[PDB]
Design a protein around this nucleic acid. Sequence first.
RNA 1: UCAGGGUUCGAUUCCGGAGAGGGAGCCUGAGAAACGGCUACCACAUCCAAGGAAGGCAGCAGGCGCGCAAAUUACCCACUCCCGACCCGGGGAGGUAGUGACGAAAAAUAACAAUACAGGACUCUUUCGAGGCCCUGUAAUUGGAAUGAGUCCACUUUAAAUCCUUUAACGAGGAUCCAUUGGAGGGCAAGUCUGGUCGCAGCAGCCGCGGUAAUUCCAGCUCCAAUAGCGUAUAUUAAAGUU
Lengths: 58, 126, 188, 142
Amino acid sequence: VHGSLARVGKVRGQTLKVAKQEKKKKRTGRAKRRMQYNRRFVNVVPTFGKKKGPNANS
Amino acid sequence: DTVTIRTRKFMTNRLLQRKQMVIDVLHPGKATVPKTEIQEKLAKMYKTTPDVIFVFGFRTHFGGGKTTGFGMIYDSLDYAKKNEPKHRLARHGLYEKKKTSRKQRKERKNRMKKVRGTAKANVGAG
Amino acid sequence: MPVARSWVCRKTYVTPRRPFEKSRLDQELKLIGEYGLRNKREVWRVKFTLAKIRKAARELLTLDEKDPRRLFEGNALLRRLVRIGVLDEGKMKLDYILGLKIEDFLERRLQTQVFKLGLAKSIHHARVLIRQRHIRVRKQVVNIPSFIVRLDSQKHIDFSLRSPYGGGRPGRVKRKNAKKGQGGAGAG
Amino acid sequence: MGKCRGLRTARKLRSHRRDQKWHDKQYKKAHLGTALKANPFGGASHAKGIVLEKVGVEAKQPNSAIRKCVRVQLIKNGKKITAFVPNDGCLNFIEENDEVLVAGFGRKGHAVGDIPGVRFKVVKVANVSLLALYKGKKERPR
RNA sequence: UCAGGGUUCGAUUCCGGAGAGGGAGCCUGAGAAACGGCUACCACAUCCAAGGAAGGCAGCAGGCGCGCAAAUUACCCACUCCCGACCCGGGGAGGUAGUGACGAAAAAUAACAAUACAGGACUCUUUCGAGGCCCUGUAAUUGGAAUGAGUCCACUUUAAAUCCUUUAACGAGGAUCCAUUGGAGGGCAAGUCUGGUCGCAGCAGCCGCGGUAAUUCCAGCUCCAAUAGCGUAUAUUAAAGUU
């Protein structure tokens, strides 16, 4: 351990800092509901019955 | 020009020495019509001078092209100067509004209440 | 202090009781996508007007046949559904009001009619033609996509007379492009 | 089991219900007013007080931590309170002998989670919010 | 707020009552035990040449104190109505504008073509391959057309003005004319990604996460929900057949 126990703010002060990697604008209003409809219903690829969620990483 | 005028729900009014009606104006592709152009066209309809004609309250519908207002024609100018409210005579030079503020009138009254007999020194220049 | 104002107003929708019901979420999104709506509140408005219609018909069906109130308010509710084209003239009794669905009302919007009448190429193009002053109902320029079209008003939807389609002046893009194009020869 | 049913029994029914409502724990404390005299806020949703002392309280097992708290004296009554300070490092903003706005912890006078005997939390310091300090939108004026 | 039966609230624009710092007494008048009338005691408190004199915002604006907690010392009798000897004078009653995410209704923030790759019908063919017509994206990036948000002249508006509606002139390629507030173990929609910390710092309504390979802390990316709005504290109705 470095310095004392019961020291406030430790982990937020240790953590290495990284800048935002985004650039492009997102859609708003009607145009976002249009995009969500086309992605969820219109053209879709089938799977085995253990069906897969929208954010599957591995 | 395309600017056209019509009159609706008309009445003669012998108790106030006038005739009175609703006025509809068609004007597609233009801004609202000036009241000076409206009253000379009404003069040409009723075959009077425009000097005894009063018009007011014009409002324009959404998408344009049509507007509606109210108007009156008097039998002579001495009946008009008795029966019209003073602000409509002032719109074209027949009456002049007094130029004091309401607070000047209030505070002169409250200074006069502190004196008795021939109070004019608190009135002419006080 | 006393004042000449008035304070009457009301809400026109209700929120659902289960926030995250999977069976409800995708059903509402399919209605948004098929009719070209902006948000969930725009669907919850139409469910609320239908619920109030069915709540009144279910009351009148309790009263005896030929009760004076069942005769008067029942004939009024049935005329008012036919006037907007939601109900068929050949049906015309309270028993068939209980068979209506939300998609009967979403079809009577001006945005749906501008697309189905062929003035536009999609349900998303129709809203943009309405909201940009291009479209007319009888004599009147109208600017509101949720306007509900009466059955005699149905045959009088058209372009505006002061519009670049419909016979008016060209827009500010075509005028500038022509101006600076002639200026390409010099002195413009 | 035996409830009376006769057509003239309304005085027995009405007055027995009135008598038995006083055995419900929520009804009684709302209507006697002893809880309204005892509560260190006089029926308010929030209160202002002055920071006396900064302290660390040991969490209840089966877990292990030191929970950062403050002891506070309220302006309108002069009585004493202890309150929790949310988020990582926020104790560094608070200082001593200055005003905080305090709020309830979310359970209507009962304690929350592993912290023994703490009923309140800090929400504003010297007229700036802890959220606006923590997300870097504002700073303490000096 | 509510299946049916109920529970809780009502200082607050309409109607009735009470009171003008606290108690008491009384003049005038058709009508008052009146406070923008008077007399005295009790509590405050202003001026003085120390003899004396004067006072009542729980009216409209404005200030101090209190507290979690509440707007301008603006314009006018034009409208609605009232008072007087009156067709004429008066009205902080009342009307108008300012502040105002208490709260309610409507409604933008991208539409459409062409091109390359992609899905799936259908036809010729044993299969391979080709023709194919209707819908998705998204990149090196293409193309023309539409429009109000803003700026600003005129009419209209009104007591005089502002605002709204009407109408000339400027006004869009996206790297801006850049949408936010809370979440991603379960209840409960959505990551058995990648870096840091090591029962510490912290999270967690509730059950629970962290002791060197964290689905829960701190951050990057991706995704979820509602949307001009979303989170938290506290009173209260339903759920409660837990009165």
